[PDB]
């Protein structure tokens, strides 16, 4: 388990959740959102050594493999295992609309 | 749901004059939720003003909007030629977005007489079922003409498809194409045929007719 | 600068469904909500609905609350407006435009348009008929295209020569379900043995070419 | 859609499915399987430029983002999307057992 | 030099669930199959079952099918055997060894073992007592540790200054649910009353270390 | 569901001698499906042979296996001191895995009479509840022994909690420790007590005894 509760609380060198703030206007040009002005949809990065939160048997077997054949270029990558929504507030004309965007924020990570 | 009603339906003015279009909303709009677009024949709408009085990029200075609540007005101070077209107002204060029935701003020019020309069905069409009788109106103004054919001196019944061209660019008049499309049926039945056309020219309705003959 | 390129015109059978598309020049597709507005022959504009990119949430005008569908594909960097249960009334020009910023704003960038014609027709036309009239001074010669379909038709004269006097009319739909227009051309009586009354009519859809001559 | 049917028929440079044979003993040290002697578990490799098989909205945002700020080092990764099973044959004492290991082979890939 | 380290020994009440573990020190875990063998006190070896890594396919033994749950874990490189609804017979040393390769092989790498005690009793004891004689040369006396729990009990003499003749015996379980073992040592009658003989007893579970001597 | 049988149950010999420990399986096990283990007091069994005659890495050449079907035999050629422990044969040709009943390999030596001793129910023990009486054989061989107590010529082997110790290392003898746990209910009402024994290394049996007295 490599989530906010652990990744943030430490200084992990390998696969972990990394904080990142994205401003709707400034970083996506989305001039349609009203609030927030942005959000913390993080990302993942860092090496995936043998047996590090392997996603599937595959992610495991490829793990052991790349461990012995470093120059074969098949090291499982670090990708979001958990994503959470992000309530937003945008206006449709002159009416408040409070919807919930899905798979917007990375809450934890794995080596797939 | 929210209806915009522009006026006047048609605004004919001379190049240089000040054009003043209006738009009235069934409900109040804020100070920044109305818009103005111009549409040139055969083209996508061009954005002119948003909110109100807020000129869209690249739009000339002569285009100024204004208003709030329910009454908004678009004003073209010095009318250039590439300004005579169709103008719609759009509101976006309450879904759904809604436009106006439009406004036609066209060139006002000296009245002109319509060069009428009757046409007899072709031999290549008459030896067949149908018979298309054409009647022209070359160049006139303000295209405010009403037409009615005469089947052996008699008013017509739902048999008149007549399209009209756009105000020409070299001369600024209109051309009409009134067509009485009737087959050989009632054609070889009567003999008198005319293209009466009453136009604003002081009670002088002309009517070029023809008997059924060739050259 | 942002460019919008909609698909080409389309002819459809009632009851079927058409899927028009808008091409966005990448650097602005992900940051612009897109609306779709159609325009019927000689009628006003109708906002159909719209959609926000990436998040893929679209809203439609109640009028089409159940048969229109606007979606986006960032990969293809295009947005599709699929309208089903096609009616004859659906025949019109479907424009696609990007809003200034909000879901419901003014629109500054549009497409060329897309003529979607709904007809119970087969590509059949055009029937070119030469017609002439008759102390006259001046008269006109009317070359009359009659029945044809669909409606994307060009009519140049003399392989593209006689340009003045010409009055290529607006094709009206006939109860037969097909269009008809006319290329009348006023000319000085001083033109008789002129030898060039060519009336070129390019019906684009069907492989058709026509050139008539008016007399008498 | 980056599947075998596509990544294998074109010499792709970006994210795509790469072929890989894993011999059970020589590579994994599993002296416990009878048949097969190995299998084609594949892997995924290669850059994830904006607009390239986005698993989620986040992957899209993180793609559209990392493009304008490669410096942040948050480019989404290439990871298996659809995985097929691999049946095997192993003996318990002398009874033969044919079971199907799940999530063992990669068929399609996405950028997450 | 590949190692397997199990968890500390545990004592639990009947009808409960114990969770013993095994540590494959480092790297050779997947390439290996882990079986579980348990030895009842003074008894033989029972084959609990086995499990295969990465894939997690366990093949238990009929005798335990339904209560034992051997599962490995690579994120921690450790496998955990789990037996619930424990009878008194379940009490024994649980070994965790790796097989030579096949699912059912001759394991060559064993763990240290884990003493699982299943019984109705509490952490208590012990009741230490001395053992006196009262004649002829070279007589022997001893010590005694009674009614204790659990089994772990080391008994030395004079802080370990005595080993020759010392005979620490095998505990026993009476109908009292508590353990009790005897301890003796032979010594010369000439060194009676001259040198001191202490019974340094130890009990790891409950903090307890008793002493005692001899005279008669 | 597949039982093995090693023999003898106990094999006693002197270093240098050849030990031949056999195991006969219920059903056949072909070959290369039967292992041989060793187990010294307080240790995890160590592998010697698997299948048969194929000895685990790092195992003295004296250790060799052999056999097939239902008759495998472990053979230790020149027995070493560190080679006296318990041995089991394990089969893995058919789940569940099963083991032999084991085989003790104790070192042989001259006979030894048990130095029988007795203890009185300690005072501190006679205090809380009631005490138990402790008997004690010191060094004998070959552990062949039975020990019945005595209460005025009476006892019912209903408190015969005797336990033997592991063969010594310095010498090679056993030591038994029979306990006689009773209560004041039957203790305070009898006088004569004795640890009647009988080890078959004695030309005659013996019985240390005592009447509850003091220092």
- The CATH number of whichever domain residue F146 belongs to comes to 2.60.40.10
| Spatial contact of A86 and A100, defined as CB atoms under 8 Å apart | yes
Q: Which of B34, B43, B51 is nearest to B88 (CA)?
A: B34
| Spatial contact of E82 and E19, defined as CB atoms under 8 Å apart | yes
- Nearest CA-CA distance, residue E133 and chain F, Å: 6
- Please classify residue B160 by burial: count the beta carbons closer than 10 Å to its beta carbon, then call 0-12 exposed, 13-18 middle and 19+ buried: middle
| Spatial contact of F192 and F151, defined as CB atoms under 8 Å apart | yes
Q: How far is CA B169 from CA B166, B173, C42, in A?
A: 9, 8, 20
Place of tokens 């003043």: B20
**CATH architecture of the domain formed by C121-216:** Sandwich (2.60)
Q: Which of F158, F163, F107, F156 is nearest to F134 (CA)?
A: F163
| Spatial contact of B74 and B89, defined as CB atoms under 8 Å apart | yes
Rounded to the nearest 5 percent, the helix, strand and coil shares of chain E are 5, 40, 55
Q: Chain A contact for E55, CB < 8 A?
A: yes
CATH code for the domain defined by A1-112: 2.10.90.10
- From chain A, pick out residues whose CB is under 8 angstroms from the CB of C28: 29
The C-alpha atoms of residue E143 and residue E160 are separated, in whole angstroms, by 14
The D-side interface with A (CB below 8 A) comprises 18, 20, 22, 27-28, 41, 43-45, 55-59, 61-62, 64-65, 68, 72-74, 76-80, 83, 101-106, 112
- From chain E, pick out residues whose CB is under 8 angstroms from the CB of F175: 167, 169, 184
Residues sharing a CB contact under 8 Å with residue D46, sequence separation 6 or more, in sequence order? D12, D13, D14, D15, D16, D78
Q: Chain D contact for E61, CB < 8 A?
A: no
Strands (DSSP E) found in chain E: 4-6, 10-12, 18-24, 34-39, 45-52, 57-60, 78-83, 92-98, 109-110, 115-118, 127-131, 140-148, 154-155, 167-168, 179-186, 201-203, 208-210
For CA atoms B47, B53, B57, B63, the dihedral sign is: positive
Q: Which two three-digit tokens encode residue F209?
A: 């005894």
The C-alpha atoms of residue F47 and residue E187 are separated, in whole angstroms, by 41
| Spatial contact of F126 and E74, defined as CB atoms under 8 Å apart | no
Dihedral, CA of residue B27, residue B28, residue B32 and residue B34, to nearest 10: 30
Q: Chain F contact for E192, CB < 8 A?
A: no
Q: Please, what's the b/e burial string for B110-128 (b: 16 or more CB within 10 A of its CB; e: otherwise)?
A: eebebbbbbbbbbeebbee
- From chain E, pick out residues whose CB is under 8 angstroms from the CB of A57: 54-55
- From chain F, pick out residues whose CB is under 8 angstroms from the CB of E110: 44-46
The C-alpha atoms of residue E106 and residue F49 are separated, in whole angstroms, by 8
To 5 degrees, how large is the angle CA E139–CA E145–CA E150?
Answer: 150
Q: Chain A contact for C57, CB < 8 A?
A: yes
**Residues recorded for chain E:** 216
Q: Look at residues F82, F109, F136 and tell me which one is the last residue of a structural domain.
A: F109
| Spatial contact of D99 and E57, defined as CB atoms under 8 Å apart | yes
The C-alpha atoms of residue D24 and residue D20 are separated, in whole angstroms, by 13
The C-alpha atoms of residue B194 and residue B133 are separated, in whole angstroms, by 10
Chains that touch F (3 or more CB pairs under 8 A): D, E
Closest to B45 (Cβ–Cβ): which among C110, C171, C180?
C110
Cβ pairs bridging D and E (under 8 Å): 27
Largest CA distance in chain B: 69
Distance of CA E191 to the CA centre of its chain: 36
Place of tokens 């107590």: F149
- Please classify residue E15 by burial: count the beta carbons closer than 10 Å to its beta carbon, then call 0-12 exposed, 13-18 middle and 19+ buried: exposed
- From chain B, pick out residues whose CB is under 8 angstroms from the CB of A95: 94-95
Residues sharing a CB contact under 8 Å with residue C66, sequence separation 6 or more, in sequence order? none
- Nearest CA-CA distance, residue B95 and chain A, Å: 6
F95 and F117 inside one domain: no
> C166 phi and psi, to 5 degrees?
-60, 145
Instruction: State the total domains in chain F.
Output: 2
Distance of CA E195 to the CA centre of its chain: 34
F37 and F22 inside one domain: yes
- From chain E, pick out residues whose CB is under 8 angstroms from the CB of A60: 30, 54, 74
Under an 8 A CB cutoff, do F88 and E131 touch? no
- From chain A, pick out residues whose CB is under 8 angstroms from the CB of E72: none
Under an 8 A CB cutoff, do E103 and D30 touch? no
* Closest residue, chain E, to A52 (C-alpha): E75
Q: What is the DSSP letter of A37?
A: S
B195 and B177 inside one domain: yes
Largest CA distance in chain E: 71
Chains that touch C (3 or more CB pairs under 8 A): A, B, D
Pairing of strands B104-107, B10-13: parallel
Q: Which two three-digit tokens encode residue A35?
A: 């609030």
Residue C144 forms beta bridges with which residues? C129
Residues sharing a CB contact under 8 Å with residue E215, sequence separation 6 or more, in sequence order? E132, E193, F215
Q: How far is CA C22 from CA A66, C44, C63, C111, F79, in A?
A: 44, 21, 22, 7, 91
F and A interact (at least 3 Cβ pairs within 8 A): no
D and E interact (at least 3 Cβ pairs within 8 A): yes
F134 and F188 inside one domain: yes
Under an 8 A CB cutoff, do A77 and D77 touch? yes
B114 and B200 inside one domain: yes
- Nearest CA-CA distance, residue D94 and chain A, Å: 26
Place of tokens 């003999």: B191
DSSP string covering F27-95? S---SS-EEEEEE-TTS--EEEESSSS-BPSS--TTEE--EETTEEEEEESS--GGG-SEEEEEE-SSS
Residues sharing a CB contact under 8 Å with residue F57, sequence separation 6 or more, in sequence order? none
Chain E 22-41, CB below 8 Å of chain A: which residues? Answer: 30
- Matching fold, domains E1-120 and E121-216: yes
Chains that touch E (3 or more CB pairs under 8 A): A, D, F
Residues sharing a CB contact under 8 Å with residue D79, sequence separation 6 or more, in sequence order? A76, A77, A79, A112, D44, D109, D110, D111, D112
Q: Which two three-digit tokens encode residue D95?
A: 């009874």
- Supply the range of the domain harboring residue B48: 1-109
Under an 8 A CB cutoff, do A80 and D56 touch? yes
For CA atoms A46, A49, A52, A54, the dihedral sign is: positive
Q: Chain D contact for C77, CB < 8 A?
A: yes
The C-alpha atoms of residue C48 and residue F109 are separated, in whole angstroms, by 107
Place of tokens 């070299």: B170
| Spatial contact of E161 and E197, defined as CB atoms under 8 Å apart | no
* Closest residue, chain D, to E102 (C-alpha): D32
CATH number for E1-120: choose from 3.30.2290.10, 3.30.43.10, 1.10.540.10, 2.60.40.10.
Answer: 2.60.40.10
Q: How many CB atoms lie within 10 A of CB C25?
A: 13
C and A interact (at least 3 Cβ pairs within 8 A): yes
- Please classify residue D40 by burial: count the beta carbons closer than 10 Å to its beta carbon, then call 0-12 exposed, 13-18 middle and 19+ buried: middle
- From chain A, pick out residues whose CB is under 8 angstroms from the CB of D27: 64-65, 68
Q: Look at residues F109, F142, F173 and tell me which one is the last residue of a structural domain.
A: F109
The C-alpha atoms of residue F6 and residue F24 are separated, in whole angstroms, by 6
Q: Indicate the domain borders of chain D.
A: 1-112
Q: Indicate the domain borders of chain E.
A: 1-120, 121-216
- Preceding omega of E126 cis (within 30 degrees of 0): yes
The A-side interface with D (CB below 8 A) comprises 18, 20, 22, 27-28, 41, 43-45, 56-59, 61-62, 64-65, 68, 72-74, 76-80, 83, 101-106, 112
Rg (alpha carbons) of chain F, rounded to whole number: 23
F204 and F119 inside one domain: yes
- Nearest CA-CA distance, residue F68 and chain D, Å: 16
Under an 8 A CB cutoff, do A28 and C52 touch? no
Under an 8 A CB cutoff, do A61 and E77 touch? no
Q: Which two three-digit tokens encode residue F77?
A: 């050629």
Place of tokens 């097969």: D36
F42 and F132 inside one domain: no
- From chain A, pick out residues whose CB is under 8 angstroms from the CB of D74: 18, 20, 43, 45
Report which secondary-structure segment, H or E, holds D27.
Answer: helix D24-28
F116 and F206 inside one domain: yes
Resolution attained, angstroms:
3.1
Under an 8 A CB cutoff, do F128 and E182 touch? no
To 5 degrees, how large is the angle CA E109–CA E115–CA E117?
Answer: 150
For CA atoms E171, E177, E178, E183, the dihedral sign is: negative
Q: Which of D94, D95, D96 to mutate to test the interface with F (most CBs of F within 10 A)?
A: D94
- Please classify residue E152 by burial: count the beta carbons closer than 10 Å to its beta carbon, then call 0-12 exposed, 13-18 middle and 19+ buried: middle
* Closest residue, chain A, to B97 (C-alpha): A93
């Amino acid at each position: 388990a490599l989530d906010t509760n652990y990744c943030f609380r430490n200084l992990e060198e390998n696969c972990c959740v990394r904080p990142l703030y994205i401003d709707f206007r400034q970083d996506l040009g989305w001039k349609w959102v009203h609030e927030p002005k942005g959000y913390y949809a993080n990302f993942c990065s860092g090496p995936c050594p043998y047996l590090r939160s392997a996603d599937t048997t595959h992610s495991t077997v490829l793990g052991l493999y790349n461990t012995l054949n470093p120059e074969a270029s098949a090291s499982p990558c670090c990708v979001p295992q958990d994503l959470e929504p992000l309530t937003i507030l945008y206006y449709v004309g002159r009416t408040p609309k409070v919807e919930q965007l899905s798979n917007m924020v990375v809450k934890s990570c794995k080596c797939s | 749901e929210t209806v915009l009603t522009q006026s006047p339906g048609t605004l004919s003015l001379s190049p240089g004059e000040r054009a003043t279009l209006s738009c009235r909303a069934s409900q109040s709009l804020g100070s920044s939720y109305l818009a103005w677009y111009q549409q040139k024949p055969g083209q996508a709408p061009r954005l002119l003003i948003y909110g109100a009085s807020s000129r869209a990029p690249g739009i000339p200075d002569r285009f100024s909007g204004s208003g709030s609540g329910t009454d908004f007005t678009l004003t073209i101070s010095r009318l250039e030629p590439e300004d005579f077209a169709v103008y719609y107002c759009q509101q976006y204060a309450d879904s759904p977005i809604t436009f106006g029935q439009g406004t036609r701003l066209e060139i006002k020019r000296t009245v002109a007489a319509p060069s009428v020309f009757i046409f007899p069905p072709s031999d290549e069409q008459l030896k067949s079922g149908t018979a298309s009788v054409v009647c022209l109106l070359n160049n006139f103004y303000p295209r405010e003409a009403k037409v009615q054919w005469k089947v052996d001196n008699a008013l017509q019944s739902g048999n008149s498809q007549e399209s009209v061209t756009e105000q020409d660019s070299k001369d600024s008049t209109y051309s009409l194409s009134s067509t009485l499309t009737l087959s050989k049926a009632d054609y070889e039945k009567h003999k008198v045929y005319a293209c009466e056309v009453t136009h604003q020219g002081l009670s002088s309705p002309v009517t070029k007719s023809f008997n059924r003959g060739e050259c | 600068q942002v460019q919008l390129v909609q698909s080409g015109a389309e002819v459809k059978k009632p009851g079927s469904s058409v899927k028009v598309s808008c091409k966005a020049s990448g650097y602005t597709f992900s940051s612009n909500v897109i609306s779709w507005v159609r325009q019927a022959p000689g009628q006003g504009l109708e906002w159909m609905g719209g959609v926000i990119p990436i998040v893929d949430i679209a809203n439609y005008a109640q009028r089409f609350k159940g048969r229109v569908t606007i979606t986006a594909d960032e990969s293809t960097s295009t947005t599709y407006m699929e309208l089903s249960s096609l009616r004859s009334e659906d025949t019109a020009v479907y424009y696609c435009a990007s809003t200034l910023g909000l879901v419901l704003d003014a629109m500054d960038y549009w497409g060329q348009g897309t003529l979607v014609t709904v007809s119970s027709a087969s590509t059949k036309g055009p029937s070119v008929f030469p017609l002439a009239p008759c102390s006259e001074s001046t008269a006109a010669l009317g070359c009359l295209v009659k029945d044809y379909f669909p409606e994307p038709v060009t009519v140049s004269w003399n392989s593209g020569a006689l340009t003045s006097g010409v009055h290529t009319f607006p094709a009206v739909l006939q109860s037969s379900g097909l269009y008809s227009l006319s290329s009348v051309v006023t000319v000085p009586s001083s033109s008789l043995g002129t030898k060039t009354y060519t009336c070129n009519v390019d019906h684009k859809p069907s492989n058709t070419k026509v050139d008539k001559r008016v007399e008498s």
